[PDB]
Design a protein around this ligand. Structure first.
Ligand SMILES: Nc1ncnc2c1ncn2[C@@H]1O[C@H](COP(=O)(O)OP(=O)(O)O)[C@@H](O)[C@H]1O
Ligand SMILES: Nc1ncnc2c1ncn2[C@@H]1O[C@H](COP(=O)(O)OP(=O)(O)O)[C@@H](O)[C@H]1O
Ligand SMILES: [Mg+2]
Ligand SMILES: [Mg+2]
Ligand SMILES: [Mg+2]
Ligand SMILES: [Mg+2]
Lengths: 52, 260, 532, 528, 48, 205
């Protein structure tokens, strides 16, 4: 699969932050329908900036 | 992966969305109105946009297929020996009763079949039943003699979709099985998928409903699953276009504009 | 940092792994291609032996773990289901396509361009086959069907006896021919009941001009041969009549118990008398028959067969004019059995085949049926004969339905390789590499045949490519399109006039399915394998 | 298979025979090449190999990486062997040989798969290799002027090209100048042992220096050593192999006396023996005393009293280097300490470098040796710097032997590929396929350069092939400019012998791998 | 010696080959040939 | 020493992978143990009467079949035993033998499986499971019967209650009186190849 939501859901991630990202992708799938990869990438980049 | 078949899939997805909504005054799209049926075999070029409904159940009445000018009837009662709601039994104390039991049983079944046939029904859908025999051998034989296609084991959760697609109003007691509770259709038939299975398609319905069915074909299971996911993505894009009708350029343009 | 419970392979590692798996699956069956191919023997670690040459069978029997290897296995299975022949060629082509595509990707060609090139190449190859390399079978005759069957029978346990088995197969298929609405002739293969029985040699296999049952008469007292048979097909058991679960017998006056017990079997007696009063001779039923009803049939001098398979009964009823009866209930609520629903056959016998007996329904009326009794040295050989016969029957069906065949022996694929290499120089910049690699990978089959024949694969393939290049370049040398490979002498040969054919659908479906499988595998660049 | 009541070979023997065995051999060679693939070019990266004891070895050198990989595949061991061979004979090109051999095998793999006889492939490789070596010798550029300035520039350019792939590439001009000077300071044999290399922790790379003389670490000074002066302005150096300390006269000597006067005479005799040795050394005129053997505390204090310098236990190699630099003679006897056998340097100093004390012998006018003093921040840093300097030194030595060069950056192999394809287009055709495969396999190195640099190798290769086809012999890969350029005018120079030996060894390895058809492995004994 | 404890003393080809448990599949094929010959005609089992 | 309420918190969130990986094998061995314990110590802790038909049944079972009588499948893995019990449907009966008087009963199982194709007689070595010293010493002959994953016949030390010279009919009657053994012409060789397409015969005008 190329679907971001399906990729995130299919592999158990074991980390609370990663699990919240999984739910984020599911929510984007529910509301928008697609763009499920972009939302996860955006969240990851935002937190990466939060580091610095 | 279906980017190569997009030339066939994208118009199909757009038609599927536009056939289940009213373009004027529509606020959302219920994707459950669009049913995806995955059938192994063939290639993705073989994906179809049948406008009626596709039933995976097989015709019990083997020897009668391709009913033309179908009068489809959907029933929710059982065509077998009588059985009351509370526990019941028939006591026999004489051989005359031994004969009369099965004589009256066949008479009751024949009456049921005659009542069904008198309405002009020629395609019959039978809901799945687990407590009581949905369709007995005698009832099937009688329906075959009357030349009626019988398709049993219809799922309970699929009743609403079938009724929306065709127009058959379900019947739970034979007393209300009348002619106006039937769904007229142009053609109901069973087709062979080149040795990869059998499908039942009811194409062409008077007063068609607001449902469509998309048949997905592929060489292997994985590509079929991914094709279904991609088709769902396209339908979801059209849906989220229906609500909040606004379009923007893609290709990374909105993100770079946001950054700047 | 990712912290997923499993193993992750990224990039070139997983791609090379997929290519390794596909190539291993290819090499499993690569030695069993073409007339010089050899069969394989399989053991199911309990002692069961399966000698086979069919690629689909070999790949189905093996237990496989890798997912791409599974993809190729089900690809062969799909090719078998939808065509019936070429289940090894499709796997070989798919593996070669995947290997060359992986090479291109390793050359830093993006996989999307490779996929686009493969798609375009498949479309162009199919179009070129359709408009250039098809041979209409109407101007060839029954020899065309015989040659197609013989070609399908090469590289099989029945290859040398092709002159005989092809005649059998063609006759059987022509026997089960039927037409449907709008006048389309149809050939329902798998209605030819293939019965196996070890014993006499292969040449003693029989083509039954009727139907053959793997069943025997119910009781020894019944006759074993009926001349003018009146078959009655039934779908219910003839036993003592027991009331259903909802009906219960409760006796308060003892005087009626005996009458109840008498009626309990007199019901079935009356039903059987109704059956036999119409002149029925042979009674086939799917249900069982108990001893009392067996005696009822014996005293009347009739035949009764129990536990007849449903498909066999349906075939017999359709071929004899009889109608299956689940119940003896008419539309007036009575127990009746009219003579109109009796099927007739010219003779019904019980032959003895190698210490075992089977029932022959010979020369049924209102429809011509067919069945084949295969005699072999032992069970394994008989199974291999049956599989090869199924392949040949499917090939003949394909040829008869769609009336186009293409030359065999790697001619079509050499022509495709030359044409595709020439055509790739038309459009694209990086897709040209993909199309050229498609053309190159199409040559794996003539290479495989030459290797299996222990011939000079390089020289033979070079000569074949030269012949086809000359055929394409020179307008007046178009008759060289049919130049294929003669594996016996190791030299090119005009296979169209040598009698080597195969249905066009085989090649077209093989190309489409192999391209689809290669595309499916090529999209992968990451594998996450969770622990169980 | 059958049980065969008495079996032929030893139980547990493994045998592989046929085409599958050869294909597996080719695949194993591919695997071995992949392990060193990314360490080629100015954009090449390093590898870190940890051994069982925990030591890490960080290197770019192909031979080093292959050695540190405990390869046990019989067919794959050949690539390691040819890498070692290239390192031994040439000193550079150890990564190119493995890539070339694996590419030859990969190119002829399809022909093997379709049942081509290995002898034909072997003959084709031999023919192509002979033609390629002849072409290299023909088109290699040399200058028949023997000009000192031009020879120095040629050596510097070759050293810079050799170093422009290591972690010291940013300082390749500095190290190239140092390496060329060090090599030219060697007399006639260019012995490697006359170029000492000392690694001192701490300090920038530019802090590293070349000593026109000899330098070595301080060697376990005794008491009273901190009294001797640590700088001399025209010292005479007494190179010795002598144990200057109180000790038994001989291992088997025994003294038998029966009078206290003789006892005292014996004690005074031992003291007088030591003092006579020291007196001969002092009156020799020398001021710096170096000994291969220990120098005791008594002699240390004796030399301190005379403002003399002593350093015992000097390593033997450092003593030879000191003899070659200052110009004396190692003396095992202190009797004939004439001025002929005494070394002489302009300045001796004992300075501190990075927490270590080093003795410096500078100002040697007729020195025939050098001593690199490398600085860095970690022991692996300095080790890899030494490896790169070794590559440069071997290249400069070979260039001194013969100053024939070809342009690098894949230009030479693109030219060779064009020549081989042109030749192969003029033969009947069975050998044509194999020679064309050889020519195509020659294209691995420019493609690997582009892949490592992150380019698109296909476009660069197309441009290179078109350029060579229409004319222009020395057009290779321009890493910095994202494009192609004339590498000869870019001063990307390599000695011709590097490519010559690389092609020869790769061809030999390919032929040896292809010839083998059956592999037999006897059961291994003493398994513990 | 039958695995069930019985004893078969004969010189018939099929009877002897019927009481052998083999592992090699070619031996299984040979045994099946013996059985086929015995069932089809009843004699000539050792000859085949 | 204070702070006994450690509340390890983040600790097992980053080291979770190792704990789960080891717990998977621990639970695998736990399931193997839960499958083999009931085999161990669970039972080890504890003239029509002349059967004229016994001989007739013996001669009937003498002629097993045509294509030989096969052999009892041997299980070489504890996990093989576990997933052999796991597979098949619930109604399928599986009978297991533990061994190291065993040959006679092994032949009895051979004859029964030849004449009772429905049942799935099988055997396993006692060293494969690795039972206790008492079981591997004085509890070898044990007809272990499984159906649907639950124990039905847990006989142990069967050489006592079944004798030593017993034949196939003896053990068959011993099993059938328990109601543990479930209650036909011989084909030529075979008839069926595949049943996939229902396109058989039609005569449309
Ligand atoms: N007599 C023949 N001469 C040359 N080629 C043949 C001949 N018979 C068959 N072939 C070729 O051998 C190839 C392999 O066929 P085979 O492997 O038996 O079918 P499958 O691929 O279904 O196993 C086919 O492509 C066919 O064209
Ligand atoms: N400045 C440069 N520009 C382009 N290519 C270069 C340059 N310097 C070295 N090369 C190439 O790098 C290759 C040498 O890589 P390296 O790993 O250092 O040694 P080896 O010869 O063992 O691979 C040579 O083929 C040479 O052509
Ligand atoms: Mg999207
Ligand atoms: Mg075939
Ligand atoms: Mg280098
Ligand atoms: Mg005889």
């Amino acid at each position: 699969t190329n679907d971001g939501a399906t990729i995130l859901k299919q592999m158990q991630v074991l980390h609370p932050a990663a699990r919240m990202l999984v739910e984020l992708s599911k929510a984007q799938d529910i509301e928008a329908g697609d763009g499920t990869t972009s939302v996860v990438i955006i969240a990851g980049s935002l937190l990466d900036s939060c580091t610095k | 992966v279906v980017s190569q078949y997009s030339s066939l899939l994208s118009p199909m997805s757009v038609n599927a969305v536009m056939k289940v909504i009213d373009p004027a005054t529509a606020t959302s799209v219920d994707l459950r109105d669009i049913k995806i049926v995955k059938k192994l075999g063939g290639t993705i070029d073989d994906c179809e946009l049948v406008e009626g409904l596709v039933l995976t159940q097989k015709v019990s009445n083997s020897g009668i297929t391709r009913v033309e000018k179908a009068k489809i009837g959907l029933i929710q009662f059982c065509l077998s020996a009588p059985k009351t709601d509370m526990d019941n039994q028939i006591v026999v104390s004489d051989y005359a009763q031994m004969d009369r039991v099965l004589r009256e049983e066949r008479a009751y079944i024949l009456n049921l079949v005659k009542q069904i046939k008198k309405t002009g029904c020629n395609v019959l859908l039978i809901q799945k039943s687990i407590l009581r025999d949905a369709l007995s051998d005698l009832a099937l034989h009688f329906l075959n003699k009357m030349k009626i296609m019988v398709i049993k084991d219809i799922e309970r959760e699929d009743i609403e979709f079938i009724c929306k697609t065709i127009g058959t109003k379900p019947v739970a007691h034979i007393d209300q099985f009348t002619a106006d509770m039937l769904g007229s259709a142009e053609l109901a038939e069973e087709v062979n998928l080149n040795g990869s299975g059998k499908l039942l398609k009811i194409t062409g319905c008077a007063s068609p409903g607001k449902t469509v069915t998309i048949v997905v074909r592929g060489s292997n299971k994985l590509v079929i699953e991914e094709a279904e996911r991609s088709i769902h993505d396209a339908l979801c894009v059209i849906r989220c276009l229906v609500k909040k009708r606004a379009l923007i350029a893609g290709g990374g343009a909105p993100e770079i504009e946001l950054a700047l | 940092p990712l912290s997923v419970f499993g193993d992750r392979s990224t990039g070139e590692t997983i791609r090379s792994q997929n290519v390794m798996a596909a190539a291993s699956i290819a090499n499993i069956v690569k030695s069993s291609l073409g007339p010089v191919g050899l069969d394989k023997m399989l053991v199911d670690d309990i002692g069961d032996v399966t000698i086979t040459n069919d690629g689909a069978t070999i790949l189905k029997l093996l237990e496989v773990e890798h997912p791409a290897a599974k993809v190729l296995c089900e690809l062969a299975d799909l090719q078998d289901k939808e065509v019936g022949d070429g289940t090894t060629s499709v796997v070989i082509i798919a593996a070669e396509l995947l290997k060359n595509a992986d090479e291109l990707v390793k050359q830093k060609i993006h996989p999307t361009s490779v996929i686009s090139g493969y798609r375009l190449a498949c479309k162009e190859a199919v179009r070129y086959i359709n408009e250039n390399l098809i041979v209409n079978t109407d101007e060839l005759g029954r020899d065309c069907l015989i040659n197609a069957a013989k070609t399908s029978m090469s590289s099989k346990i029945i290859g040398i006896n092709g002159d005989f088995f092809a005649n059998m197969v063609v006759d059987a298929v022509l026997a089960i021919k039927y037409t449907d609405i709008r006048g389309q002739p149809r050939y329902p293969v798998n209605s030819v009941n293939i019965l196996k029985a070890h014993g006499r040699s292969q040449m003693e296999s029989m083509l039954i001009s009727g139907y053959a049952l793997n069943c025997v008469v119910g009781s020894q007292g019944m006759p074993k041969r009926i001349v003018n048979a009146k078959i009655a097909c039934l779908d219910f058991s003839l036993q003592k009549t027991k009331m259903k679960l909802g009906v219960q017998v409760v006796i308060t006056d003892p005087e009626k118990l005996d009458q109840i017990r008498q009626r309990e079997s007199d019901i079935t007696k009356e039903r059987i008398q109704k059956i036999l009063a119409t002149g029925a001779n042979v009674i086939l039923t799917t249900g069982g028959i108990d001893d009392m009803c067996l005696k009822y049939f014996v005293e009347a001098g009739a035949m009764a067969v129990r536990r007849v398979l449903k498909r066999d009964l349906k075939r017999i009823a359709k071929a004899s004019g009889a109608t299956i009866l689940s119940t003896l209930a008419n539309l007036e609520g009575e127990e009746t059995f009219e003579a109109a629903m009796l099927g007739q056959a010219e003779e019904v016998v019980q032959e003895r085949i190698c210490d075992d007996e089977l029932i022959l329904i010979k020369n049924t009326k209102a429809r011509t049926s067919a069945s084949i009794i295969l005699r072999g040295a032992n069970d394994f050989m008989c199974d291999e004969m049956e599989r090869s016969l199924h392949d040949a029957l499917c090939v003949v069906k394909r040829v008869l339905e769609s009336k186009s065949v293409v030359p065999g022996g790697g001619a079509v694929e050499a022509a495709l390789s030359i044409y595709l290499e020439n055509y790739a120089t038309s459009m694209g910049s990086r897709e040209q590499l993909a199309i050229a690699e498609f053309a190159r990978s199409l040559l794996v089959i003539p290479n495989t045949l030459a290797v299996n024949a222990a011939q000079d694969s390089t020289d033979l393939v070079a000569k074949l490519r030269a012949f086809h290049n000359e055929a394409q370049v020179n307008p007046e040398r178009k008759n060289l399109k049919w130049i294929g490979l003669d594996l016996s002498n190791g030299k090119p040969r005009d296979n169209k006039q040598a009698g080597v054919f195969e249905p066009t659908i085989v090649k077209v479906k093989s190309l489409k399915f192999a391209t689809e499988a290669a595309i499916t595998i090529l999209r992968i660049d990451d594998l996450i394998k969770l622990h169980p | 298979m059958m049980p065969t009541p008495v079996i032929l070979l030893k139980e547990g023997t493994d045998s592989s025979q046929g085409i599958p065995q050869l294909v597996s051999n080719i695949s194993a060679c591919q695997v071995i090449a992949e392990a060193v693939r990314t360490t080629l070019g100015p954009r090449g990266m390093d590898k870190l190999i940890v051994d069982g004891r925990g030591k890490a070895t960080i290197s770019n050198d192909g031979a080093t990486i292959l050695k540190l990989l405990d390869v046990v595949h019989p067919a794959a061991k050949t690539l390691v062997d040819i890498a070692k061979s290239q390192d031994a004979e040439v000193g550079d090109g150890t990564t190119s040989v493995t890539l070339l051999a694996a590419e030859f095998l990969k190119q002829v793999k399809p022909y093997v798969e379709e049942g081509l006889h290995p002898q034909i492939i072997i003959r084709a490789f031999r023919t192509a290799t002979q033609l390629a070596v002849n072409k290299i010798k023909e088109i290699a550029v040399t200058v028949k002027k023997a000009d000192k300035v031009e020879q120095r520039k040629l050596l510097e350019k070759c050293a810079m090209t050799a170093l422009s792939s290591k972690l010291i590439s940013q300082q390749k001009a500095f190290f190239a100048k140092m390496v060329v000077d060090a090599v030219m300071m060697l007399d006639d044999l260019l012995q490697l042992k006359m170029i000492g290399i000392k690694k001192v922790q701490g300090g920038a790379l530019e802090d590293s220096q070349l000593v026109a003389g000899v330098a070595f670490k301080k060697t376990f000074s005794y008491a009273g050593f901190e009294m001797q002066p640590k700088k001399y302005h025209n010292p005479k150096i007494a190179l010795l192999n002598v144990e200057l300390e109180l000790k038994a006269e001989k291992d088997n000597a025994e003294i038998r006396v029966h009078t206290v006067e003789d006892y005292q005479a014996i004690v005074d005799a031992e003291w007088n023996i030591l003092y006579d040795k020291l007196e001969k050394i002092h009156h020799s005129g020398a001021k710096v005393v170096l000994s291969k053997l220990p120098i005791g505390d008594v002699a240390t204090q004796y030399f301190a009293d005379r403002d003399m310098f002593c350093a015992g236990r000097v390593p033997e190699e450092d003593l030879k280097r000191t003899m070659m630099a200052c110009g004396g003679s190692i003396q095992t006897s202190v009797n004939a300490l004439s001025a002929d056998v005494l070394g002489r340097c302009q300045v001796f100093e004992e300075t501190q470098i990075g927490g270590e004390r080093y003795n410096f012998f500078t100002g040697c006018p007729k020195a025939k040796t050098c001593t690199f003093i490398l600085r860095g921040g970690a022991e692996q840093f300095m080790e890899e710097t030494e490896r790169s300097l070794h590559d440069a030194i071997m290249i400069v030595r070979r260039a001194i032997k013969n100053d024939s060069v070809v342009a690098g950056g894949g230009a030479i192999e693109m030219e060779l590929s064009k020549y081989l394809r042109d030749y192969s287009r003029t033969i009947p055709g069975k050998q044509q396929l194999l020679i064309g495969a050889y020519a195509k396999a020659l294209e691995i190195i420019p493609r690997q350069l582009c892949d490592n640099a992150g380019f698109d190798a296909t476009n660069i290769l197309n441009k290179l092939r078109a350029r060579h086809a229409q004319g222009g012999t020395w057009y290779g890969v321009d890493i910095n400019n994202e494009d192609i350029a004339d590498n000869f005018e870019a001063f990307v120079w390599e000695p011709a012998m590097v490519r010559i030996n690389a092609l020869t060894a790769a061809s030999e390895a390919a032929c040896l791998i292809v010839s083998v058809d059956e592999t037999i492995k006897n059961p291994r004994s003493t398994v513990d | 010696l039958d695995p069930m404890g019985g004893i078969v003393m004969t010189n018939d080809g099929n009877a002897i080959l019927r009481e052998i448990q083999v592992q090699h599949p070619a031996a299984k094929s040979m045994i099946e040939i013996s059985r086929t010959q015995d069932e089809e005609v009843g004699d000539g089992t050792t000859s085949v | 020493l204070a702070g006994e309420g450690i509340s390890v918190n983040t600790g097992p969130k980053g080291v979770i992978n190792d704990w789960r990986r080891f717990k998977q094998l621990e639970t695998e061995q736990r399931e193997e143990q839960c499958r083999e314990m009931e085999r161990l110590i669970k039972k080890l802790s504890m003239f029509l009467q002349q059967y004229r038909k016994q001989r007739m049944e013996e001669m009937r079972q003498q002629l097993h079949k045509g294509p030989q009588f096969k052999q009892v499948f041997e299980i070489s893995s504890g996990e093989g035993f576990l997933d052999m019990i796991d597979k098949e449907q619930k109604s399928i009966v599986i009978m297991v033998h533990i061994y190291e008087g065993t040959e006679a009963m092994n032949g009895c199982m051979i004859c029964l499986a030849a004449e009772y194709p429905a049942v799935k007689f099988c055997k396993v070595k006692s060293s494969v499971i690795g039972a206790s010293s008492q079981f591997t010493r004085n509890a070898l002959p044990a007809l272990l019967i499984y159906k649907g994953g639950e124990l039905i016949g847990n006989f142990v030390r069967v050489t006592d209650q079944l004798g030593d010279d017993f034949f196939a009919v003896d053990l068959e009657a011993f099993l059938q009186e328990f109601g543990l053994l479930p209650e036909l012409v011989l084909t030529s060789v075979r008839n069926s190849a595949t049943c996939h397409s229902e396109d058989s015969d039609l005569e449309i005008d």
